[PDB]
Enzyme design. Structure first.
Site, PDB file in Angstrom:
ATOM      1  N   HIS B  64      42.753  54.242  37.738  1.00 33.81           N
ATOM      2  CA  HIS B  64      43.082  53.619  39.026  1.00 33.81           C
ATOM      3  C   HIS B  64      44.340  52.762  38.925  1.00 33.81           C
ATOM      4  O   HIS B  64      44.502  51.786  39.657  1.00 33.81           O
ATOM      5  CB  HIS B  64      41.896  52.807  39.572  1.00 33.81           C
ATOM      6  CG  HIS B  64      40.714  53.637  39.987  1.00 33.81           C
ATOM      7  ND1 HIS B  64      40.450  53.967  41.307  1.00 33.81           N
ATOM      8  CD2 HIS B  64      39.710  54.187  39.258  1.00 33.81           C
ATOM      9  CE1 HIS B  64      39.360  54.709  41.366  1.00 33.81           C
ATOM     10  NE2 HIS B  64      38.879  54.847  40.140  1.00 33.81           N
ATOM     11  N   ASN B 137      34.318  54.041  45.946  1.00 27.14           N
ATOM     12  CA  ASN B 137      35.228  55.172  46.059  1.00 27.14           C
ATOM     13  C   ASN B 137      35.138  55.759  47.465  1.00 27.14           C
ATOM     14  O   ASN B 137      34.275  55.397  48.262  1.00 27.14           O
ATOM     15  CB  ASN B 137      34.922  56.239  44.993  1.00 27.14           C
ATOM     16  CG  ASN B 137      35.621  55.959  43.671  1.00 27.14           C
ATOM     17  OD1 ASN B 137      36.585  55.194  43.618  1.00 27.14           O
ATOM     18  ND2 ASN B 137      35.136  56.560  42.598  1.00 27.14           N
ATOM     19  N   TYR B 347      33.922  46.783  33.176  1.00 31.75           N
ATOM     20  CA  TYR B 347      35.024  46.157  33.917  1.00 31.75           C
ATOM     21  C   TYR B 347      35.403  44.771  33.395  1.00 31.75           C
ATOM     22  O   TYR B 347      36.599  44.536  33.143  1.00 31.75           O
ATOM     23  CB  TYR B 347      34.679  46.096  35.409  1.00 31.75           C
ATOM     24  CG  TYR B 347      34.661  47.407  36.112  1.00 31.75           C
ATOM     25  CD1 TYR B 347      33.789  48.396  35.729  1.00 31.75           C
ATOM     26  CD2 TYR B 347      35.525  47.669  37.160  1.00 31.75           C
ATOM     27  CE1 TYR B 347      33.760  49.616  36.368  1.00 31.75           C
ATOM     28  CE2 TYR B 347      35.493  48.903  37.823  1.00 31.75           C
ATOM     29  CZ  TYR B 347      34.594  49.856  37.418  1.00 31.75           C
ATOM     30  OH  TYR B 347      34.505  51.067  38.037  1.00 31.75           O
TER      31      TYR B 347
END
Ligand SMILES: [Cl-]
Ligand SMILES: [Cl-]
Ligand SMILES: [Cl-]
Ligand SMILES: [Cl-]
Ligand SMILES: [Cl-]
Ligand SMILES: [K+]
Ligand SMILES: [K+]
Ligand SMILES: [K+]
Ligand SMILES: [K+]
Ligand SMILES: [K+]
Ligand SMILES: [K+]
Ligand SMILES: [K+]
Ligand code: NA
Ligand code: NA
Ligand code: NA
Ligand code: NA
Lengths: 502, 502, 502, 502
Positions: B64, B137, B347
């Protein structure tokens, strides 16, 4: 009114210590009280906390790692605007905030505050024209006048690469083969090597700087910061004992002083000399192993500062403080001292490694003057808005001002260049009879004006060199006997008691 | 009125471009105007600027990397407090500031906005109870339901390790051997793989989450963000032509829409299901390759948001933005979807590497709720004061509050454990007849309801898989034929025209 | 035998994709095949794999991020020891291993190979006297001759700080106010800005260097690498069309050439002139915006190199490759070209940021010559043994050698210094009549020797500058008019087709 | 032949200390020998050296920062393949290379080796199945059985956030409010807290592990390493006096012992129990504050190891050594000890921060087993080839092998799960009569088998807690009185001598 405990994203926790687990069934056990099973990846509260813990440490300063700091205030007390146009100096009574970090040199973070070493005495001035850093030591000289030697020297003051032990052989091997070091070695091994309190030691620019007045005239400058409590020292035995009793003695001494309201203070002086006087002296003004004799160059008071405010958080304000000799204001410029010159590059270079490229956005390091650098943008941990939409080059779409150039006055021209650039090594084995030993000879006589100081110097050297092997010992006696023969011989006699030969 | 150009320490400069040099004498030269010689180490202005320039780049997102962002405002329009006790949802009309980042998946920082890919749609809600990251998404499914496969899958979507080129052969080799991927593959190769504008696509949680109300009752939740402009797509050829004409098209489209007042907006819905309903479904609520059929789990409106403010500085606010599924509030918890579970770790882990351990002190990442983490201290670039003198453990000397735990209600118990922990792989080669191919078959039927979508889907696959070798192509036709044999054959025909054999 | 799949510490795995979970009991579900439950922190294989994945990315080069590489062989074909004592040149037919990386300048890692840009042509020679880096471009001039302008210039060639979009207004705003850029700007908007193949372009030192022979005599040098396939270019439309279809075209072209055995090769030349000659020229040899006319200073062949080995791993050999102009051998020294000077610092500086302090231990970066730096030790990721127990200073306990210094011959003295150091800005707005526009006028006449090149040049400018506002456009027309007015008018006419006024 | 001194790029230097400068003309000065002027940016040899020096330091370990290490050899002496199928144990006489690192806990680098603290006893086994790290302490117990407490606890063992001084108040405030700590606190304040030599201390797994044999049968295991020289301690006064005299005593003691051929050795034992036996015990095998009584679980010998090789470079082999409990081999698994579980994440997490993602490519950390992780690639300082062109996912185009699953035998099934996951806090204020004080009472009795050990224990506490304030002191007395009231009374008596009250 009591704050809610949270996670890093700010969500309130309900228990500070409990953690998530797929519990094993132990109801039939002799002791069924525990609720124990494998930990769960989803316990954010735990992993958040352990991952932060795991990253607490940043690299320590490559030198001067062990330090103590305070905030304070500097005040102009005399007019020296004939020497320096600095705005923070331009009015008697004008006050300026400062931050000071004191430090030792060789020791790491857990080392003793009472060790024999030079002391760092580094002060940041938050002025209306930018942050001025005066990165000084508690001595007016240093071991080197060639910048390439600093990694070599510092290595020999630290630990052996195989054993991780301090090693007197390499310590003295370096010094006897680079004999310009002797002036600072003598100062280091006087009792000023073991100050009794950071509040009771001086600071010195060490290097010559060049200050410019509003007419563009410059002079060479040495700066002196003298403790208002005077210089007070431990002796070798006191300092070593204290190292094992309270390795953090000076940190606490400074902190408690300030909590009590007994604020330590210093008086600020300069020496000055013109290029014409420099040409007449037996030493170069660019030689960091030299002082300017007080009779020829008297001190002239200009200000005072006081440390009156302890840090709230040591890591954030002291550990993360960054000082650089290249952080200056327009009226104060480096001399061509080769060692200073190399320091101009080295501090910012190390700061970027230790703290990150945006280290001047850390609060202790922030200027209070407005910073406007359109062409310097991004980098890790940009936290100051990064100038928003401001164009990131010298643009037509954005007006700005520059200062008028400090034009050098024909009355005081800059130094004239020789005919070519060259490589030069200003050191090595020196002749006993040259001026390079005259200042060390003068230091010996200064010792002799205070009863006990010559004997303490010789004893302080002997207990240290006794550890080196016999061939190094002998080079060391020769080395000090290049100052006055009686010095090397008084040391040899005491070393022979401590380190017998047969 | 115009700001003075400075150095990083705030000292004003006199010339933006002039640099210091040991000038060579060229006064007798044919052209003697230049003033050139070796550059001086003491030019702080220059070295300051270049050293910062040299560290502009931080590592890009591993996935991303290429994105666009905007600030906006979320508003409650319906009461769902029976489903979720969240404070930002607890009053119709209540507004919460948000930040959204859109992105592609595979491409790097200079790749085309219009490339075929899923699109990321991640929003940070700055709520009273902490920052809630909805990391969604533009698809309600994904390629995997086993977290270990994500490095495998992502590598095949990116570049060959030797050539640094995209490689159709590994792209498809991965997919035909891990056939749980086909549902998202079909979505990817529909025209929704090439949205016409980020303002004209949807967002979906994709995973199931568990939301809790004030009574401690929980339900499984799917979240849907539907564009108020509808879903609008490019076809394969529009998207490819745009890759060369304007690779930043979507980024400019979003920015210009906001600059001119045409603020994009979305309406927010949830789907809900109980544990008893979940136990009757042919699919697992923990299966990211599954949707919940609308007729069976209808959408329920709860709010809307609008993006109405462009970033001032792209790097400081978009490139440094950090989002994590595990940044949540107490009434919103993850389900045991194994892919989501590993995102809870991955993350914050990657954030620490890309931005530094204290990245939540970067402004865009800062919570608006009060953050109180006394045991998490220090680390690189601590800029928020590091909580001052606050004790750094759970201590007697400093009072604090916790919340009361959301006790799970006996009316909706937590899921019951099986007898043992085990290792499980939920993928590989699958049976055409099984339910894992049923929702793909339904997507084919959905394509059929709009003229051209079935034709375009086969075309979009065909142009891509024609670059693979013939043995892989064979496996691909065979893979799509597990859905409906018409699909594989329709693709085989067009691939044979583009990639002739014999 | 096939290798065992392992963890990072060498433990053999039993399953590549299975992961450990506290399974939920779903035996009574309609579909009970899944074994799903929350993931366990003790799954080392999973977390080890994801944590590495999370750290795959390092910062891309601040410029020249997009690149392709190959190993090869340089071979001496003519004797030039009259000019240069370099050991790798000291025998006809002497072969030296090389590594070359090509690149664009402004584009990020996912950007188009066929974009209009200068190309980088950077080669590392692994010689017995150290690694020599020739960090060249595919043009013999450049946009600046003031090192301070580089961050400004590069920023304008990149993206707007708020929108992250390319911006023709800042692009041309910089160029028209710093008018020494025009020679390289004309080269850029020729068809040489869009080579058809890395294999079909030249390399040029661009800067003047200074080479020394065994007697200490030195000459100024310019190096030229001419493709054996000659210079072949796309036109603007082909390049733009290829940006969409194959953004990695050049990378694939180079790799496929070597894979099939069509090894590209270049022939290597020098221009040379003495200090006495330099004094007669209307240009400075330190001016990077200037060339040396061929008929005055003709090329002299000295060797050739061939690229004949593709990388095995792109990340390890190409992405981690590091080049610096300051990586040289004793007989090749930089000149006082101010841009080349700042590059001596900038590249090792950015390398330590991008790769780590010990980046020269990365295999592609290792010297084949023996490295011995006892005083340079430690640092992150010391992998070469750190010299074991070798003293870390210049010691009496470890014997070492130093070469003799090339004493500069009295026949060819070093450049004489002027009286004083100074600050100089070598640019800004220039007079049309000055020699700074003469070599641009000559380039125009070179374009005229080939039909269409002149009009193609104007077309390439027009399509780019048509995107800028009308005030910028006007400035651009005058800018080019300073070379010849007909150029500004040709460009104005076409921009008016594209960018109407009324 | 002696080696040539070079730069980092391998170019030989002519002079080690000379540096380039634009010399000032001082020919007319009283002392005209110096050649001094501003330093030049082109002096690569100087800037290379300084820039490396500026980056020597990496973060110290967040705990166990101060350390000493050595290589050696492990040998199987008895057969335990009935308990564990580890290949390195499968043959009598089989030898395995090891590396061991010893350390304290709280002290930073530079702190005293003789400090009161637990000792790290950490050992890396280079087996054919992978690197196995046995990350042990010199005590069989620890202060916590809840992983969330480790950052709280360690902070209270280190420095105050404001002063940077150790603080007895926070030290004891943590322990008296989390009273599961007392067992280890008693061990810490016995004379085992101040070993006389790293060669004269034991090591202990502390945690229970699970070891599997070839049939899939597993037992709980505790590991004991008993020094062949026995346990030999200093008393408190000796420890402290030595801190000032030789803060690196233990480091030198280990090095010299090895240097002179007096290699230290340890004999290795295990305790074992089945799940059936664990269910009968008054303690949980998952409780790190407990031991297994020797009478019920006798030691069983299985091997021995010797440290017989000193490191050649301390930084490269000791400072960069990385150990983790999750580096294991298939037959040795962790138990659900909550502390151990969190250590499986935490050590690799900090390793990547401290050393970089690719730290297992540092030589001391490299496995000697073949490592093959195709899906783990790139990252900073990839130095091992990055597997070349091997595919970076599980591919049809690369054959590989996996091992067979060690399927758990139904004679020894895994632990059974309770009904639900849950959060849990296993500590806090505890009842004096509970079994959590029995092993501390037993340790009191162990002390009493040896004259003076009980009295030294109380003295060792009293000199520490005497520095806390009187309310904290009072709580410490009650805390130790929960073991036996006589203990607190004795401590209170001595504290009162040191800390008088009105
Ligand atoms: Cl005396
Ligand atoms: Cl990290
Ligand atoms: Cl159709
Ligand atoms: Cl750096
Ligand atoms: Cl007693
Ligand atoms: K001085
Ligand atoms: K910059
Ligand atoms: K879904
Ligand atoms: K600049
Ligand atoms: K040129
Ligand atoms: K234990
Ligand atoms: K990976
Ligand atoms: Na229980
Ligand atoms: Na001139
Ligand atoms: Na099941
Ligand atoms: Na001289």
């Amino acid at each position: 009114q009591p704050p809610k405990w949270t996670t890093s994203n700010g969500a309130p926790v309900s228990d500070v210590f409990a953690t998530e687990r797929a519990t094993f069934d132990n109801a039939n056990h002799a002791n069924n009280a525990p609720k124990v099973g494998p930990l769960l990846l989803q316990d954010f509260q735990l992993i958040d906390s352990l991952a932060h813990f795991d990253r607490e440490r940043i690299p320590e300063r490559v030198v001067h790692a062990k330090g103590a700091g305070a905030f304070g205030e500097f005040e102009v007390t005399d007019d020296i605007s004939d020497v320096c146009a600095a705005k923070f100096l331009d009015t008697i009574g004008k006050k300026t905030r400062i931050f000071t970090r004191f430090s030792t040199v060789g020791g790491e973070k857990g080392s003793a505050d009472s060790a024999r070493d030079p002391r760092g005495f580094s002060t940041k001035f938050y002025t209306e024209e930018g942050n001025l850093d005066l990165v000084y030591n508690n001595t007016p000289i240093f071991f080197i006048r060639d910048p390439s030697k600093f990694p070599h020297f510092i290595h020999t003051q630290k630990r052996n690469p195989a054993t991780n032990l301090k090693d007197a052989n390499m310590f003295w091997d370096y010094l006897v083969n680079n004999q310009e070091s002797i002036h600072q070695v003598m100062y280091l091994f006087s009792d000023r090597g073991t100050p009794a309190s950071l509040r009771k030691m001086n600071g010195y620019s060490g290097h010559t700087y060049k200050w410019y007045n509003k007419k563009g005239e410059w002079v060479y400058v040495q700066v002196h910061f003298k403790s208002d409590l005077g210089v007070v020292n431990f002796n070798n035995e006191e300092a070593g004992k204290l190292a094992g009793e309270d390795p953090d003695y000076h940190t606490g001494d400074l902190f408690n002083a300030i909590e009590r309201g007994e604020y330590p203070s210093w008086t600020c002086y300069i020496q000055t000399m013109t290029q014409e006087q420099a040409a007449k002296q037996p030493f170069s003004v660019f030689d960091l192993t030299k002082v300017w004799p007080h009779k020829d160059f008297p001190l002239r008071r200009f200000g005072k500062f006081t440390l009156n405010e302890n840090p709230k958080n040591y890591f954030a304000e002291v550990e993360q403080a960054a000082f650089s000799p290249s952080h200056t204001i327009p009226s104060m410029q480096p001399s061509a001292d080769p060692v200073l010159q190399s320091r101009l590059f080295s501090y910012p270079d190390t700061h970027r490694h230790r703290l990150g490229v945006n280290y001047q956005q850390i609060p202790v390091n922030c200027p209070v003057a407005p910073v406007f650098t359109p062409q310097m943008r991004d980098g890790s941990m940009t936290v100051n808005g990064n100038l928003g939409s401001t164009p990131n080059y010298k643009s037509s779409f954005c007006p700005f001002s520059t200062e008028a150039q400090i034009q050098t006055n024909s009355h005081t021209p800059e130094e004239v260049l020789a005919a070519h650039t060259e490589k030069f090594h200003w050191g090595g084995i020196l002749d006993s009879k040259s001026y390079d030993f005259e200042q060390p000879r003068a230091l010996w006589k200064v010792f002799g004006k205070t009863p006990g100081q010559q004997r303490n110097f010789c004893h302080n050297v002997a207990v240290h060199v006794a550890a080196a092997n016999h061939e190094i010992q002998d080079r060391v006696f020769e080395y000090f006997s290049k100052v006055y023969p009686e010095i090397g011989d008084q040391i040899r006699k005491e070393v022979l008691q401590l380190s017998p030969r047969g």
